[PDB]
Design an enzyme around this catalytic site. Structure first.
Site, PDB file in Angstrom:
ATOM      1  N   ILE A  13      54.833  31.424   4.954  1.00 11.97           N
ATOM      2  CA  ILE A  13      55.670  32.610   5.101  1.00 11.97           C
ATOM      3  C   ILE A  13      56.242  32.740   6.513  1.00 11.97           C
ATOM      4  O   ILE A  13      57.020  33.653   6.789  1.00 11.97           O
ATOM      5  CB  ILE A  13      54.883  33.892   4.737  1.00 11.97           C
ATOM      6  CG1 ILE A  13      53.647  34.051   5.632  1.00 11.97           C
ATOM      7  CG2 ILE A  13      54.497  33.854   3.257  1.00 11.97           C
ATOM      8  CD1 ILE A  13      52.847  35.324   5.373  1.00 11.97           C
ATOM      9  N   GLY A  14      55.876  31.817   7.400  1.00 13.55           N
ATOM     10  CA  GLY A  14      56.445  31.789   8.737  1.00 13.55           C
ATOM     11  C   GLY A  14      56.226  30.467   9.451  1.00 13.55           C
ATOM     12  O   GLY A  14      55.270  29.746   9.162  1.00 13.55           O
ATOM     13  N   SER A  15      57.122  30.144  10.379  1.00 13.17           N
ATOM     14  CA  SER A  15      56.972  28.954  11.212  1.00 13.17           C
ATOM     15  C   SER A  15      57.811  29.059  12.485  1.00 13.17           C
ATOM     16  O   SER A  15      58.822  29.761  12.524  1.00 13.17           O
ATOM     17  CB  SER A  15      57.356  27.693  10.430  1.00 13.17           C
ATOM     18  OG  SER A  15      58.734  27.683  10.106  1.00 13.17           O
ATOM     19  N   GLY A  16      57.370  28.358  13.526  1.00 14.36           N
ATOM     20  CA  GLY A  16      58.049  28.347  14.810  1.00 14.36           C
ATOM     21  C   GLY A  16      57.238  27.534  15.799  1.00 14.36           C
ATOM     22  O   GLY A  16      56.334  26.798  15.404  1.00 14.36           O
ATOM     23  N   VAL A  21      52.481  30.344   9.595  1.00 15.13           N
ATOM     24  CA  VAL A  21      51.738  31.423   8.951  1.00 15.13           C
ATOM     25  C   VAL A  21      51.719  31.190   7.449  1.00 15.13           C
ATOM     26  O   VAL A  21      52.752  30.886   6.848  1.00 15.13           O
ATOM     27  CB  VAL A  21      52.354  32.810   9.236  1.00 15.13           C
ATOM     28  CG1 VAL A  21      51.520  33.918   8.596  1.00 15.13           C
ATOM     29  CG2 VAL A  21      52.466  33.046  10.721  1.00 15.13           C
ATOM     30  N   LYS A  36      47.599  32.776  10.507  1.00 18.52           N
ATOM     31  CA  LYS A  36      48.396  32.010  11.451  1.00 18.52           C
ATOM     32  C   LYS A  36      47.605  30.786  11.882  1.00 18.52           C
ATOM     33  O   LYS A  36      46.440  30.899  12.251  1.00 18.52           O
ATOM     34  CB  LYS A  36      48.772  32.863  12.664  1.00 18.52           C
ATOM     35  CG  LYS A  36      49.748  32.189  13.618  1.00 18.52           C
ATOM     36  CD  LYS A  36      50.218  33.151  14.696  1.00 18.52           C
ATOM     37  CE  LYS A  36      49.394  33.016  15.962  1.00 18.52           C
ATOM     38  NZ  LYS A  36      49.577  34.183  16.867  1.00 18.52           N
ATOM     39  N   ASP A 134      55.939  44.043  23.050  1.00 19.21           N
ATOM     40  CA  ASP A 134      56.838  43.185  22.288  1.00 19.21           C
ATOM     41  C   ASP A 134      57.258  43.842  20.977  1.00 19.21           C
ATOM     42  O   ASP A 134      57.278  43.204  19.929  1.00 19.21           O
ATOM     43  CB  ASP A 134      56.178  41.829  22.025  1.00 19.21           C
ATOM     44  CG  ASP A 134      57.176  40.760  21.610  1.00 19.21           C
ATOM     45  OD1 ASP A 134      58.366  40.875  21.973  1.00 19.21           O
ATOM     46  OD2 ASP A 134      56.767  39.802  20.921  1.00 19.21           O
ATOM     47  N   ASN A 139      58.281  42.110  14.533  1.00 22.86           N
ATOM     48  CA  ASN A 139      56.865  42.401  14.758  1.00 22.86           C
ATOM     49  C   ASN A 139      56.424  43.697  14.088  1.00 22.86           C
ATOM     50  O   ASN A 139      55.302  44.161  14.290  1.00 22.86           O
ATOM     51  CB  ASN A 139      56.581  42.465  16.259  1.00 22.86           C
ATOM     52  CG  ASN A 139      56.629  41.101  16.915  1.00 22.86           C
ATOM     53  OD1 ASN A 139      56.455  40.074  16.257  1.00 22.86           O
ATOM     54  ND2 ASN A 139      56.871  41.080  18.216  1.00 22.86           N
TER      55      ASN A 139
HETATM   56  C1  LIG Z   1      49.273  36.258  11.247  1.00 20.37           C
HETATM   57  C2  LIG Z   1      50.469  36.287  11.857  1.00 20.37           C
HETATM   58  C3  LIG Z   1      51.211  37.514  12.106  1.00 20.37           C
HETATM   59  N1  LIG Z   1      51.547  38.074  10.825  1.00 20.37           N
HETATM   60  C4  LIG Z   1      50.803  39.058  10.270  1.00 20.37           C
HETATM   61  O1  LIG Z   1      49.801  39.615  10.775  1.00 20.37           O
HETATM   62  C5  LIG Z   1      51.358  39.347   9.038  1.00 20.37           C
HETATM   63  C6  LIG Z   1      51.075  40.248   8.007  1.00 20.37           C
HETATM   64  N2  LIG Z   1      51.880  40.234   6.905  1.00 20.37           N
HETATM   65  C7  LIG Z   1      52.943  39.392   6.774  1.00 20.37           C
HETATM   66  N3  LIG Z   1      53.707  39.447   5.647  1.00 20.37           N
HETATM   67  C8  LIG Z   1      54.824  38.709   5.338  1.00 20.37           C
HETATM   68  C9  LIG Z   1      55.605  37.935   6.230  1.00 20.37           C
HETATM   69  C10 LIG Z   1      56.739  37.243   5.780  1.00 20.37           C
HETATM   70  C11 LIG Z   1      57.131  37.300   4.423  1.00 20.37           C
HETATM   71  N4  LIG Z   1      58.258  36.604   4.049  1.00 20.37           N
HETATM   72  C12 LIG Z   1      58.084  35.496   3.131  1.00 20.37           C
HETATM   73  C13 LIG Z   1      59.396  35.182   2.375  1.00 20.37           C
HETATM   74  N5  LIG Z   1      60.540  35.032   3.322  1.00 20.37           N
HETATM   75  C14 LIG Z   1      60.466  33.740   4.066  1.00 20.37           C
HETATM   76  C15 LIG Z   1      60.687  36.204   4.239  1.00 20.37           C
HETATM   77  C16 LIG Z   1      59.362  36.519   4.977  1.00 20.37           C
HETATM   78  C17 LIG Z   1      56.360  38.083   3.528  1.00 20.37           C
HETATM   79 CL1  LIG Z   1      56.727  38.241   1.881  1.00 20.37          CL
HETATM   80  C18 LIG Z   1      55.221  38.767   3.989  1.00 20.37           C
HETATM   81  N6  LIG Z   1      53.200  38.531   7.791  1.00 20.37           N
HETATM   82  C19 LIG Z   1      52.435  38.496   8.904  1.00 20.37           C
HETATM   83  N7  LIG Z   1      52.510  37.710   9.990  1.00 20.37           N
HETATM   84  C20 LIG Z   1      53.517  36.809  10.176  1.00 20.37           C
HETATM   85  C21 LIG Z   1      54.248  36.146   9.166  1.00 20.37           C
HETATM   86  C22 LIG Z   1      55.297  35.287   9.543  1.00 20.37           C
HETATM   87  C23 LIG Z   1      55.629  35.121  10.903  1.00 20.37           C
HETATM   88  C24 LIG Z   1      54.898  35.822  11.889  1.00 20.37           C
HETATM   89  C25 LIG Z   1      55.116  35.753  13.368  1.00 20.37           C
HETATM   90  C26 LIG Z   1      56.473  35.094  13.726  1.00 20.37           C
HETATM   91  C27 LIG Z   1      53.926  35.009  14.047  1.00 20.37           C
HETATM   92  O2  LIG Z   1      55.159  37.064  13.937  1.00 20.37           O
HETATM   93  N8  LIG Z   1      53.905  36.632  11.458  1.00 20.37           N
END
Ligand SMILES: C=CCn1c(=O)c2cnc(Nc3ccc(N4CCN(C)CC4)c(Cl)c3)nc2n1-c1cccc(C(C)(C)O)n1
Ligand SMILES: [Cl-]
Length: 260
Positions: A13-16, A21, A36, A134, A139
């Site tokens: 759900i995340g990358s960089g 993540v 993460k 930040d 965020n």
């Molecule tokens: C553990 C890392 C920080 N973090 C959370 O605590 C954390 C808690 N919840 C979510 N939920 C969430 C994040 C992203 C999508 N989507 C998927 C589909 N698409 C690609 C759009 C994005 C969906 Cl559905 C749910 N994410 C979280 N985190 C997260 C995720 C990605 C990047 C980052 C960075 C860049 C490090 O800040 N953080």
């Protein structure tokens, strides 16, 4: 491997440069978490102190409804791992991008609700003598009937003796750029106002140059929404050049325009 053992990986759900993540199910309890996974940073490096800031921010904060909950953190295989609450709505940045795509929008009411909720998160963090440093849409995370939660605590530092890693320049208050750290909570306030302006559909914020300085003079970016003059005035004082003229987080959450 603890990661492989305790969790089943569902979706990235995340990358960089920060790593990746993953949405994961924890086998024991069947709950979904955001984990993460990062290369363990060089000792004594920028990456390490930032990673440190996050663990020890968690050591202080505990649990709050408008802060992304932290569960655990560990390292293995020269990787770091951080297990957080999974917010099923993604980040505010994601929501903003999706809004722009299908041309939807946050109602004026929804902007005020966003401001109040993150404001409550800040009041708590500030009450614990910490500052986020930040705040920006990427965020702020969304659960579901909607809950906004502050995440990414890698820049969190102490109000007293801060180790200031400056945040995104787009949301950075001038006094912080000026290396004035005597009112850092008001830097979070500055950043939150611009975060709401982004949600309100303003054009992309400047990284520097003329437009950048114009904002720090207390001039709001252009906003296509028909916002009340009162709500507009609240956002303007939040980016006032004098950080002491900006409301504290606690003054913010008890403000009339926001209530209820
Ligand atoms: C553990 C890392 C920080 N973090 C959370 O605590 C954390 C808690 N919840 C979510 N939920 C969430 C994040 C992203 C999508 N989507 C998927 C589909 N698409 C690609 C759009 C994005 C969906 Cl559905 C749910 N994410 C979280 N985190 C997260 C995720 C990605 C990047 C980052 C960075 C860049 C490090 O800040 N953080
Ligand atoms: Cl202050």
């Amino acid at each position: 491997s603890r990661y492989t053992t305790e969790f089943h990986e569902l979706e990235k759900i995340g990358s960089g440069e920060f790593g990746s993540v993953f949405k994961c199910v924890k086998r024991l309890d069947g709950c979904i978490y955001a984990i993460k996974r990062s290369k363990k940073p060089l000792a004594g490096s920028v990456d390490e102190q930032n990673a440190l800031r996050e663990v020890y921010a968690h050591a202080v904060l505990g649990q709050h409804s408008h802060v992304v909950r932290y569960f655990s953190a560990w390292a293995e295989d020269d990787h770091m791992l951080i297990q957080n609450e999974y917010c099923n709505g993604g980040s505010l940045a994601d929501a903003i991008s999706e809004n722009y795509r299908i041309m939807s929008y946050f109602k004026e009411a929804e902007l005020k609700d966003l401001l109040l909720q993150v404001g409550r998160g800040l009041r708590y963090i500030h009450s614990m003598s910490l500052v986020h440093m930040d705040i920006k849409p990427s965020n702020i995370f969304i659960s579901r009937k909607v809950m906004f939660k502050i995440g990414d605590l890698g820049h969190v530092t102490r109000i007293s003796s801060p180790q200031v890693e400056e945040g995104d320049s787009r949301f950075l208050a001038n006094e912080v750029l000026q290396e004035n750290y005597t009112h850092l909570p008001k830097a979070d306030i500055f950043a939150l106002a611009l975060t709401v302006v982004c949600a309100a559909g303003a054009e992309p914020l400047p990284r520097n140059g003329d437009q950048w300085h114009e904002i720090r003079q207390g001039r709001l970016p252009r906003i296509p929404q028909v916002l009340s003059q009162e709500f507009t005035e609240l956002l303007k004082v939040m980016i006032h050049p004098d950080p002491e003229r900006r409301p504290s987080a606690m003054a913010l959450v008890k403000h009339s325009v926001l209530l209820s």
